[PDB]
Design a protein around this ligand. Structure first.
Ligand code: UIQ
Ligand code: CA
Length: 223
């Protein structure tokens, strides 16, 4: 997260860290046994870390649970980043509490100008590398489709939306991939891609979760 603020310990209780010996992606808890992330975060050997604030210190409230299976959208395209979504099933159910809780799936799509909360442990610099210990937060609005398509001509599908600031300075970044975009208490996006971080006229691009609710529901019900 570039240009954000320190969320405060466990203030974003649905946020997870995907760990393979180091943090590499974010995700969102959607019930006690399933996490939603980005397809491009797929790898083998994922440990899901719940209840984290400082990802480098055991502070209490953490739960570490191995992934039992990861389900990449069957139509994910690694060239166009279309359908950049994945479900992760936990080997055992998380213990839900005030510090570890799920986020609701949307019943409808959010409109342009909706203000959302974006969070992650990714890089905090637009130039160069600086990874935080603790979770960072950013309030950002959903941009109109025309602005989004003007910024990334030819590259925006109906499964994507832009969020952020055209003037630059505030964006998600490397390491935030797969994390939540939460608007009015519902999960509307997944951190997917961008052109650098926090550059002018190059907002972040997010997977449009409201287009996948039926798919998520049906996939979880059969696994
Ligand atoms: C593995 C990919 C997804 C990678 C991913 C994310 C991304 O932007 N990619 C580059 C990419 C690939 C294909 C594309 C593309 C950008 O635009 C059109 O087609 C991702 C990334 C995510 C968000 C931002 C941002 N909000 N500025 C910027 C970058 N980067 C950071 C590390 C992983 C890498
Ligand atoms: Ca910790």
């Amino acid at each position: 997260i570039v240009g954000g603020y320190t969320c405060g310990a466990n203030t974003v209780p649905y946020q997870v860290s995907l760990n393979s010996g180091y943090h590499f992606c974010g995700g969102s808890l959607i019930n006690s046994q399933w996490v939603v992330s980005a397809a491009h975060c797929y790898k083998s050997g994922i440990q899901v870390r719940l209840g984290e604030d400082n990802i480098n210190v055991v502070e209490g409230n953490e739960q570490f649970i191995s992934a039992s299976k990861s389900i990449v959208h069957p139509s994910y395209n690694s060239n166009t980043l279309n359908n950049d979504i994945m479900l992760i099933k936990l080997k055992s159910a998380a213990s839900l509490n005030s510090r570890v809780a799920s986020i609701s799936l949307p019943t409808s799509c959010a409109s342009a100008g909706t203000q959302c909360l974006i969070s992650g442990w990714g890089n905090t610099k637009s130039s160069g590398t600086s990874y935080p210990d603790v979770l960072k937060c950013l309030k950002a609005p959903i941009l109109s489709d025309s602005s989004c398509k003007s910024a990334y001509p030819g590259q925006i599908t109906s499964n994507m939306f832009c969020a952020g600031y055209l003037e630059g300075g505030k964006d998600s970044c490397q390491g935030d991939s797969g994390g939540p975009v939460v608007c009015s208490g519902k999960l509307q996006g997944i951190v997917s891609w961008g052109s650098g971080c926090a550059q002018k006229n190059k907002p972040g691009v997010y997977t449009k979760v409201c287009n996948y609710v039926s798919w998520i529901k049906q996939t979880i019900a059969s696994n």
